[PDB]
Amino acid sequence: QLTEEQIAEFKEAFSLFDKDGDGTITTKELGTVMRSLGQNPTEAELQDMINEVDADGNGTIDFPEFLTMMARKMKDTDSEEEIREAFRVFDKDGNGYISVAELRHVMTNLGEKLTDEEVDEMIREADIDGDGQVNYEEFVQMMTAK
Amino acid sequence: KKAVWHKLLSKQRKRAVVACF
Ligand SMILES: [Ca+2]
Ligand SMILES: [Ca+2]
Ligand SMILES: [Ca+2]
Ligand SMILES: [Ca+2]
Protein backbone atom coordinates (compact mmCIF):
# COMPACT_ATOMS: atom_id res chain seq x y z
CA GLN A 1 0.00 0.00 0.00
CA LEU A 2 2.47 2.70 1.23
CA THR A 3 6.32 2.42 0.89
CA GLU A 4 8.69 3.08 3.82
CA GLU A 5 10.08 6.42 2.40
CA GLN A 6 6.55 7.87 2.06
CA ILE A 7 5.35 6.51 5.53
CA ALA A 8 8.41 8.33 7.09
CA GLU A 9 7.61 11.56 5.13
CA PHE A 10 3.93 11.36 6.31
CA LYS A 11 5.01 10.74 9.95
CA GLU A 12 7.20 13.88 9.73
CA ALA A 13 4.14 15.81 8.39
CA PHE A 14 1.99 14.36 11.19
CA SER A 15 4.61 15.54 13.77
CA LEU A 16 4.21 19.18 12.50
CA PHE A 17 0.53 19.01 13.54
CA ASP A 18 0.94 16.88 16.72
CA LYS A 19 2.82 19.61 18.59
CA ASP A 20 2.51 17.89 22.03
CA GLY A 21 3.74 14.52 20.58
CA ASP A 22 0.75 12.71 22.22
CA GLY A 23 0.10 10.76 18.97
CA THR A 24 -3.18 12.60 18.09
CA ILE A 25 -4.19 15.70 16.15
CA THR A 26 -6.93 17.76 17.83
CA THR A 27 -9.11 20.52 16.42
CA LYS A 28 -6.89 22.87 18.49
CA GLU A 29 -3.70 21.55 16.77
CA LEU A 30 -5.29 21.69 13.29
CA GLY A 31 -6.48 25.22 14.01
CA THR A 32 -2.99 26.29 15.17
CA VAL A 33 -1.46 25.02 11.94
CA MET A 34 -4.16 26.69 9.77
CA ARG A 35 -3.80 30.05 11.55
CA SER A 36 0.01 29.85 11.10
CA LEU A 37 -0.75 29.75 7.30
CA GLY A 38 -2.82 32.97 7.59
CA GLN A 39 -6.16 31.09 7.42
CA ASN A 40 -9.10 31.94 9.73
CA PRO A 41 -11.13 28.71 10.23
CA THR A 42 -14.16 28.59 12.48
CA GLU A 43 -14.40 25.93 15.15
CA ALA A 44 -17.21 24.39 13.04
CA GLU A 45 -14.90 24.07 10.01
CA LEU A 46 -12.16 22.51 12.25
CA GLN A 47 -14.66 19.97 13.62
CA ASP A 48 -15.86 19.07 10.11
CA MET A 49 -12.27 18.52 8.91
CA ILE A 50 -11.40 16.30 11.96
CA ASN A 51 -14.68 14.33 11.44
CA GLU A 52 -13.85 13.63 7.73
CA VAL A 53 -10.47 11.99 8.66
CA ASP A 54 -11.48 10.42 12.15
CA ALA A 55 -12.33 6.71 11.40
CA ASP A 56 -13.27 5.65 14.98
CA GLY A 57 -15.29 8.80 15.82
CA ASN A 58 -13.22 9.48 19.00
CA GLY A 59 -12.83 13.15 17.80
CA THR A 60 -9.04 13.13 17.25
CA ILE A 61 -6.79 11.90 14.40
CA ASP A 62 -4.20 9.27 15.23
CA PHE A 63 -1.32 8.47 12.85
CA PRO A 64 -3.07 5.41 11.30
CA GLU A 65 -6.07 7.63 10.42
CA PHE A 66 -3.79 10.41 9.05
CA LEU A 67 -1.92 7.75 6.98
CA THR A 68 -5.23 6.54 5.43
CA MET A 69 -5.91 10.17 4.36
CA MET A 70 -2.43 10.70 2.88
CA ALA A 71 -2.75 7.35 1.02
CA ARG A 72 -6.15 8.49 -0.46
CA LYS A 73 -4.95 12.03 -1.33
CA MET A 74 -1.11 12.21 -1.52
CA LYS A 75 0.00 8.60 -2.34
CA ASP A 76 2.46 10.17 -4.94
CA THR A 77 4.57 12.85 -3.13
CA ASP A 78 8.24 13.11 -2.40
CA SER A 79 10.49 15.99 -1.36
CA GLU A 80 10.96 16.46 -5.18
CA GLU A 81 7.29 16.67 -6.44
CA GLU A 82 6.54 19.02 -3.45
CA ILE A 83 9.36 21.45 -4.40
CA ARG A 84 8.14 21.28 -8.08
CA GLU A 85 4.55 21.98 -6.97
CA ALA A 86 5.63 24.82 -4.66
CA PHE A 87 7.57 26.46 -7.52
CA ARG A 88 4.46 26.24 -9.82
CA VAL A 89 2.30 27.83 -7.08
CA PHE A 90 4.82 30.62 -6.35
CA ASP A 91 5.49 31.51 -10.03
CA LYS A 92 2.17 33.29 -10.45
CA ASP A 93 2.59 34.39 -14.12
CA GLY A 94 4.07 30.99 -15.17
CA ASN A 95 7.21 32.41 -16.85
CA GLY A 96 9.52 30.00 -14.91
CA TYR A 97 10.87 32.76 -12.62
CA ILE A 98 9.85 33.96 -9.17
CA SER A 99 9.91 37.77 -8.99
CA VAL A 100 10.08 40.08 -5.95
CA ALA A 101 6.32 40.88 -6.39
CA GLU A 102 5.38 37.18 -6.76
CA LEU A 103 7.30 36.33 -3.52
CA ARG A 104 5.52 39.17 -1.68
CA HIS A 105 2.13 37.69 -2.74
CA VAL A 106 3.17 34.17 -1.70
CA MET A 107 4.24 35.50 1.74
CA THR A 108 0.89 37.22 2.28
CA ASN A 109 -1.00 34.17 1.06
CA LEU A 110 0.87 31.99 3.62
CA GLY A 111 0.46 34.42 6.59
CA GLU A 112 4.19 35.41 6.57
CA LYS A 113 4.78 39.04 7.54
CA LEU A 114 7.12 40.79 5.09
CA THR A 115 9.13 43.86 4.35
CA ASP A 116 10.49 45.01 1.01
CA GLU A 117 14.05 44.67 2.35
CA GLU A 118 13.41 41.05 3.45
CA VAL A 119 11.93 40.15 0.00
CA ASP A 120 14.80 41.82 -1.82
CA GLU A 121 17.36 39.95 0.36
CA MET A 122 15.54 36.66 -0.25
CA ILE A 123 15.54 37.07 -4.09
CA ARG A 124 19.20 38.20 -4.09
CA GLU A 125 20.36 35.28 -1.91
CA ALA A 126 18.59 32.68 -4.08
CA ASP A 127 19.46 34.34 -7.45
CA ILE A 128 22.63 32.42 -8.45
CA ASP A 129 22.79 33.67 -12.12
CA GLY A 130 22.20 37.38 -11.09
CA ASP A 131 19.28 37.92 -13.56
CA GLY A 132 17.16 39.35 -10.69
CA GLN A 133 14.62 36.52 -10.37
CA VAL A 134 14.65 32.95 -9.03
CA ASN A 135 14.40 30.14 -11.65
CA TYR A 136 13.58 26.52 -10.80
CA GLU A 137 17.24 25.33 -10.46
CA GLU A 138 17.88 28.24 -8.07
CA PHE A 139 14.71 27.44 -6.13
CA VAL A 140 15.64 23.77 -5.80
CA GLN A 141 19.16 24.71 -4.47
CA MET A 142 17.56 26.97 -1.82
CA MET A 143 14.75 24.49 -0.87
CA THR A 144 16.62 21.12 -0.82
CA ALA A 145 17.75 21.59 2.87
CA LYS A 146 14.95 21.62 5.54
CA LYS B 1 17.40 34.51 4.97
CA LYS B 2 17.43 30.78 3.97
CA ALA B 3 15.33 30.02 7.07
CA VAL B 4 12.41 32.05 5.62
CA TRP B 5 12.64 30.28 2.23
CA HIS B 6 12.53 26.94 4.06
CA LYS B 7 9.64 28.14 6.26
CA LEU B 8 7.64 29.11 3.12
CA LEU B 9 8.21 25.64 1.58
CA SER B 10 7.02 24.06 4.80
CA LYS B 11 3.98 26.35 4.95
CA GLN B 12 3.07 25.38 1.35
CA ARG B 13 3.47 21.70 2.30
CA LYS B 14 1.26 22.17 5.39
CA ARG B 15 -1.38 23.97 3.25
CA ALA B 16 -1.43 20.90 0.93
CA VAL B 17 -1.81 18.59 3.91
CA VAL B 18 -4.59 20.73 5.48
CA ALA B 19 -6.39 20.61 2.02
CA CYS B 20 -6.41 16.74 2.36
CA PHE B 21 -8.62 16.81 5.51
CA1 LIG C 1 -1.45 16.12 19.85
CA1 LIG D 1 -9.71 8.90 15.81
CA1 LIG E 1 6.95 34.58 -12.59
CA1 LIG F 1 18.20 33.94 -11.41
Residue numbers in the entry:
A (entry chain AAA): 4 to 149
B (entry chain BBB): 1 to 21
Please quote the authors directly:
CaM is a highly conserved Ca2+-sensing protein encoded by three independent genes CALM1, CALM2 and CALM3, and all three encode an identical 16.7 kDa 148 amino-acid-long protein.
CaM-A102V was shown to lower CaM Ca2+-binding affinity and promoted spontaneous Ca2+ wave and spark activity in permeabilised cardiomyocytes. However, in the presence of Ca2+, the affinity for RyR23583-3603 was significantly reduced by up to sevenfold when compared to CaM-WT from 51±9 nM (CaM-WT) to 146±40 nM (CaM-N53I) and 349±72 nM (CaM-A102V). Interestingly, O Ile53 then forms a direct hydrogen bond with N Asp56. We observed that the Ca2+/CaM-A102V–RyR23583-3603 complex is structurally very similar to Ca2+/CaM-WT–RyR23583-3603. Even though no major structural differences could be discerned at the vicinity of the mutation, the A102 V substitution increases interaction surface hydrophobicity compared with Ca2+/CaM-WT–RyR23583-3603 structure. However, we showed for the first time that Ca2+/CaM-A102V significantly increased the substrate phosphorylation levels by ∼60%. (C) CaM-A102V: a large reduction in affinity for RyR2 reduces the inhibition of RyR2 by Ca2+/CaM, and is combined with an increase in CaMKIIδ phosphorylation activity, which promote the opening of the RyR2 channel.
